[PDB]
Amino acid sequence: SELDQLRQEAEQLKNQIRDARKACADATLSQITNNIDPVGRIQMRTRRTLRGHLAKIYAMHWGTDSRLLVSASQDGKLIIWDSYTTNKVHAIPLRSSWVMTCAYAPSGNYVACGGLDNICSIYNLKTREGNVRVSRELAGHTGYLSCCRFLDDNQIVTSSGDTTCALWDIETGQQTTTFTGHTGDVMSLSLAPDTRLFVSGACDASAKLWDVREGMCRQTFTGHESDINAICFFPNGNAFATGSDDATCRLFDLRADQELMTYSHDNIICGITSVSFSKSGRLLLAGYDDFNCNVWDALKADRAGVLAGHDNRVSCLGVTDDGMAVATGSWDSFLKIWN
Amino acid sequence: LSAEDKAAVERSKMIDRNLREDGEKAAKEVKLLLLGAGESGKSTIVKQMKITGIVETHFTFKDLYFKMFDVGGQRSERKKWIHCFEGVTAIIFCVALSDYDLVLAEDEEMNRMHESMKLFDSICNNKWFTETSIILFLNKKDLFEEKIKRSPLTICYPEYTGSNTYEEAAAYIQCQFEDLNRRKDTKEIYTHFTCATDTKNVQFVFDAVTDVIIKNNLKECGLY
C-alpha cells in the first residue's frame, strides 16, 4: 500500500497549499478596483487587411520593430508582411504544410515554425544568397509542436503535444533542458519579459511556471475547468492570463499564487483561442471561436469593446511592442490590423 | 510617393503571383486522410497505392494526383489537431476483419474489433467531418476465411445468430459498421472488401472520389 500512502499524502499537501492560499486571500482584486474609473468607449477600427493566404491561419508573430510580422498557414506558406504598406517581404515555402505555430526572433534575423511534423524548423532571413534558407531542424519532440518562442538567436523554447517543453541550443540542434510535469497536451507558452521564466498551458487544465535556467517547475496554477488554449504574461512579468475552452480568462499572480478575477459573459459560451495584453496591461484582448475578439477591462472585468471583422474562427492575435496596433488572424485566411 | 517602395511593391506583386499559381495546383489536389487502428492493414494499403508524425504519400491515377496522409504515430489528443484535416476530400478507414476474434489483452477493456468500431464512431460523427465521404476498406479478407472456419463470429458478436459462412459474417460486419453513421442521408460510406492481393481497390477509391467531386461541383454550380 505504498501507492496508497502516497496518494493520501498528496491530498494532505494539497489541503495545506489550498489553506495557505486561502490564508493570504485577504481581499479580491475586484473589490480593490471599484474606485477606479472605467476605460469607457473602446472603438477600434480595422486599418489594414492582409490578403494572400489561401488557407486557415493558425499563428502570427510581430517583429520587435512593431512593423514586420510573420504568419503561418496550412497552405504551406510562411509570409512576412510589412504591416505599414501591406507589402509581402518574404514568402517561405514549408517542407511540411501542417504547421501550428510560428515565431519571430527578437533580433529579426530568424523565424521558426513547426507542427504535426514534430519538427521546429529555423529559417535564416538574412542570407548572402538572397533567399530564405532552413538553418536548423530541431528534432526530438514526439508530438506536434504547439508553440515556440526565441530567447535569442541561439536559444528557443518549444511546447509539444508530447506533454513536455524543451529548451534548445539552435547551433548544436540539441535539447539541452527538458520541462516535464504536465500530464496533458501542452498548448501554449509565454516568455517572461526578462526571459528568466516562462509559463505553459496544457490540456490538464493547469498552468505551470518554469525556471528557464534551473530547468524545473517553480509553481503550478489550477482553476480552469477545461483546456487552456492560450496564455500571456502581464507586461511587468508579475501576472499572466489564461485563455481556456471554458470561455473564461483567469489572470494568475505568481507571487500570490492564485486567481484574482475571471472574465466571462453569460452569452459567451465558445472556446478562447488567444489572449494578449495591451502595452500598459489595462486591456486584455481575447479571441473567440464565435469569430469575435473581445476587449476586456483587465482591472474591472467589464467588456470594453468588440472587434467583429472576421467570418470564421480567430486563431491568433498579437499587440505590437510599442502598443500601437493589434493584429488578428483568422481561419478565413485574412489578417487585420486594428487601432 | 513610392521612391524606392516602387521596387518593393513590384516584389510584393511578383511573390503574390507565385502564391496564386501555387494555390491553383493545390486546389486540384485530392486530399486523403488515412485512419485505422494499428495493424489494420494501413501500411499494406499504402504499398498497394504505390509502385515523425504525419507520414505522407502521393500518387497518380487516371490523371488525378492523389495526396494521402497517414496520421501514423501521433500520441496526443485527436480533438486538438483533428480540425486541421477539415476539408479533406475523403477519409480512408481501414478495418482488419480478422481482428474480430483477438483475445483481450491483460487489462484490455474491449476486443480489437470493438475498439476499431469505437474509433469509427468518433471519426464518422466528428463535427469537422460532417460533409466528408468515408471510404471503408475491410481488409485481410484472406485471413478471415481461415479463421471463420474454426472460430465463430459470436466470439466477437455474441448476438450474432447467423451461420459461420463468409457471406453472412462479412455482410453482418459491414452492416454493423455502416449502422454507426448517424448522418446517412448527408454522408455516404463506400465499403470495399479488399485483401492482400486485391488490385481494384485503387480503382474503388478513384470511383468514390469522382462521386465526391461531382457533389462539390453540383454544390458550387448551385444545383446543390
Epitope: - | 524606392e4 513590384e10 511578383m14
Partner: single-chain antibody, 235 residues
Framework: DVQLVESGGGLVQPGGSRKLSCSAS????????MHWVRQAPEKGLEWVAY????????YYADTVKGRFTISRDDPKNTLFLQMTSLRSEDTAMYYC??????????????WGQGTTLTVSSGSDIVMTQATSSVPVTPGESVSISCRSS???????????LYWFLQRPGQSPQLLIY???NLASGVPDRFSGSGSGTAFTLTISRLEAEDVGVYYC?????????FGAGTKLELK
C-alpha cells in the same frame, strides 16, 4: 560564394556594335534587380541601365537610351547589355551590380569585377563632393562630405543616400546604405550622418587598407547619380 563575371569587352571601331555579358553564380540571380554602372578611365561612376527582377521595369540613362539594350536570361543566370552606335564617350569599365529591394534590404551590395571597353578615335539630381582629395595618416579620423541639389529625405522617413569605397584596382564596395545604415561586413569604424541635403561620412582610426575613392549616390529617383569622388591619400 557570390560571383559576377563580366565579359565581351575589347576594342571596337566607332559606330560599331558590341554585346556585353555578366555571368552570375553563387546566389539567387533571378530575384535581384541588376544594374550596369560604368566608369570612364580617369573619371567617376555613371549609371547606365537597370532591369528589375522579373524584367517588368527597365530604366536607361539619358546619354544611352535608344542605343543600349539591357536584358537578362534567368535560366542561364546571365545579364546582357547590347550596345550599338558606339561613340568615343562610351569608353569605360563596365560593372555588373546586383540590387535587391525590400523593406530593410541593402541595394547595391555586390559589384562585378568589370570589363573594359575601348572605342577608337537638368531635372537630374546633381551630387557634389567639393573636396577632390584629402591627405590622411593612419589612426587619424576623417570626415568626407557630400551635398545634394534636392532633399533626399522622403515622406516615408528614409534618406536615400549611399556611400561606396573603391580601393585602387578593385570594384567599388558598399559601405553605407540610406545614409546611416552600416553595410554588412564593413567594420564599425565607419559611420554616416547628415540631414536632408548635407551629409557626412566619418571614419575612426583610419587604417592602411582604408585608402581609396569614396563616392556618394542618391537613390531617391532615377537616374541614379554619383558624386565626383573624394580620394584619401597617405599623408
Amino acid at each position: 560564394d557570390v560571383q559576377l563575371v563580366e565579359s565581351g569587352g575589347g576594342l571596337v571601331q566607332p559606330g560599331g556594335s558590341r554585346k556585353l555579358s555578366c555571368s552570375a553564380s553563387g546566389f539567387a540571380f533571378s530575384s535581384f534587380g541588376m544594374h550596369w554602372v560604368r566608369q570612364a578611365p580617369e573619371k567617376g561612376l555613371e549609371w547606365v541601365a537597370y532591369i528589375s527582377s522579373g524584367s517588368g521595369t527597365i530604366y536607361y540613362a539619358d546619354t544611352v537610351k535608344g542605343r543600349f539594350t539591357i536584358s537578362r536570361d534567368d535560366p542561364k543566370n546571365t545579364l546582357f547589355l547590347q550596345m550599338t552606335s558606339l561613340r568615343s564617350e562610351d569608353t569605360a569599365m563596365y560593372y555588373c551590380v546586383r540590387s535587391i529591394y525590400y523593406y530593410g534590404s541593402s541595394p547595391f551590395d555586390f559589384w562585378g569585377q568589370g570589363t573594359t571597353l575601348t572605342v577608337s578615335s537638368g531635372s537630374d539630381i546633381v551630387m557634389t563632393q567639393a573636396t577632390s582629395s584629402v591627405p590622411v595618416t593612419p589612426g587619424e579620423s576623417v570626415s568626407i562630405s557630400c551635398r545634394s541639389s534636392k532633399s533626399l529625405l522622403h515622406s516615408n522617413g528614409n534618406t536615400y543616400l549611399y556611400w561606396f569605397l573603391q580601393r585602387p584596382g578593385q570594384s567599388p564596395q558598399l559601405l553605407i546604405y540610406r545614409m546611416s545604415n552600416l553595410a554588412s561586413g564593413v567594420p564599425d569604424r565607419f559611420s554616416g550622418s547628415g540631414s536632408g541635403t548635407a551629409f557626412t561620412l566619418t571614419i575612426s582610426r583610419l587604417e592602411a587598407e582604408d585608402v581609396g575613392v569614396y563616392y556618394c549616390m542618391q537613390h531617391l529617383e532615377y537616374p541614379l547619380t554619383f558624386g565626383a569622388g573624394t580620394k584619401l591619400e597617405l599623408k
